């Protein structure tokens with residue numbers, strides 16, 4: 001069952017074996033992935049998070065981010081530790097009480113403390129639209145049509161070296177899959193469809209690192225949503241999905257009744273499908289209960305290319321149709337050396353006092369804010385352009401902005417910008433050497449918004465900056481509840497920190 005929009009959510013430690021290998025984890029709702037949190041557009045969500053964690057090897061503090069939800073007027077509920085709150089300590093709870101005006105689509109939630117979401121705290125978050133403009137394109141859209149793609153590690157996250165190339169041990173599809181080494185024939189996930197029906201499959205990358213080449217043997221996929229943004233229909237036979245991205249696609253159950261492989265090939269870790277790694281099963285009602293015998297093609301003739309995507313609505317692009325054609329045009333210098341990432345010469349290390357609390361206490365320019373050099377102010381009611389030229393080791397890096405989606409004016413592997421009708425999204429691959437992926441948005445959401453690579457190991461190694469958007473209006477726009485004001489005193493008392 002789905003939970004929400006008003007619900008408790010307990011965060012616990014437990015042993016799990018999603019690939020046949022037992023390890024302890026950090027779980028929401030007792031499962032991997034966590035339960036789907038769901039509501040309708042414009043609803044009030046009140047997710048009361050109970051921190052019941054006791055195992056220090058995966059951290060006993062926590063904080064949860066609602067990925068892709070704008071949090072307008074509720075910046076304190078966004079979740080990134082030391083940006084918008086101090087962590088919740090064990091034995092305490094915290095009500096994330098916010099609204100979702102003007103958004104409907106496929107989202108997710110995850111820990112936003114250190115690399116803790118890798119240890120298991122990740123689940124889907126769906127905001128349905130009772131008047132969805134795409135409703136007539138499918139018959140079925142429910143918890144059974146959500147498809148999660150996850151990387152899974154046998155080593156606990158707090159034992160992964162900082163700045164290292166860290167590699168997973170299994171790909172999990174809907175929580176199940178097989179290990180790349182010492183492979184055992186552990187259970188594979190089954191997605192069941194009825195011949196003749198059309199399904200809104202909500203594809204969610206809950207990855208901590210790899211991108212996946214996702215396909216379904218014998219089937220094609222008609223994309224209708226990208227990171228919460230409705231798209232024109234685009235039919236493809238393969239989707240390369242980067243960490244934290246989402247797509248909805250229509251699956252037409254139009255092939256013979258049978259079993260078909262679902263494939264998710266990561267860019268690192270195990271390559272291919274031997275022993276049923278990187279796989280799940282699409283089963284038609286009436287098919288024999290047996291593994292598929294289907295083949296992938298040698299090459300995919302209609303792969304997703306990001307520049308083929310266009311919004312369903314007339315969203316356009318803000319600003320002027322040339323590079324630098326914005327009120328505040330930025331170019332970030334994105335680098336890696338010696339185990340640490342940097343942005344504009346500064347490696348991100350979380351501050352002692354969360355950025356939002358520093359601003360509410362009166363710090364009112366970005367040079368007064370800590371960490372020094374890690375906070376850039378943005379002016380209010382202005383068009384922002386951010387160029388993100390690639391080249392830093394460990395790519396391709398999927399960059400994500402909190403508090404906003406953005407027009408993708410230039411995509412990976414294509415030097416031509418699009419000032420007319422590019423897709424809008426919230427997480428974007430910045431590509432490869434020489435690329436100049438560039439995003440635009442307008443500043444109508446006061447508060448500190450994190451910008452970072454969504455490969456969680458890279459974030460931990462410093463690949464982040466904070467956009468302090470409209471510092472002067474942050475306090476008036478974001479009134480804070482007493483429970484939020486209580487978090488830093490409690491956290492610092494528990495950890496013997498003086499501030």
Ligand SMILES: *[C@@H]1O[C@H](CO)[C@@H](O[C@@H]2O[C@H](CO)[C@@H](O)[C@H](O)[C@H]2NC(C)=O)[C@H](O)[C@H]1NC(C)=O
Nearest residue numbers: 323324325329330331387389390434435436438
């Ligand atoms: C990416 O595009 C940005 C502009 O959006 C380029 O920025 C210019 O960089 C040059 C020096 O490299 C400066 O003289 C300009 O002030 C910058 N802004 C402009 C021209 O609008 C950046 O060079 C591009 N990077 C790559 C690798 O192509």
Ligand SMILES: *[C@@H]1O[C@H](CO)[C@@H](O[C@@H]2O[C@H](CO)[C@@H](O)[C@H](O)[C@H]2NC(C)=O)[C@H](O)[C@H]1NC(C)=O
Nearest residue numbers: 305307308409411414415416417418419420422
């Ligand atoms: C590279 O990106 C550009 C810009 O998004 C793509 O150019 C568009 O191509 C479409 C489809 O043919 C035309 O309708 C648009 O007028 C083009 N826009 C511009 C500004 O040129 C181009 O197709 C992409 N390249 C590849 C190989 O897909």
Ligand SMILES: [Cu+2]
Nearest residue numbers: 065067244400
């Ligand atoms: Cu996220």
Ligand SMILES: [Cu+2]
Nearest residue numbers: 067068401402
């Ligand atoms: Cu986010």
Ligand SMILES: [Cu+2]
Nearest residue numbers: 397453455458
């Ligand atoms: Cu990265």
Ligand SMILES: [Cu+2]
Nearest residue numbers: 065080402450
């Ligand atoms: Cu984030």
Ligand code: NA
Nearest residue numbers: 316317318319
């Ligand atoms: Na425009």
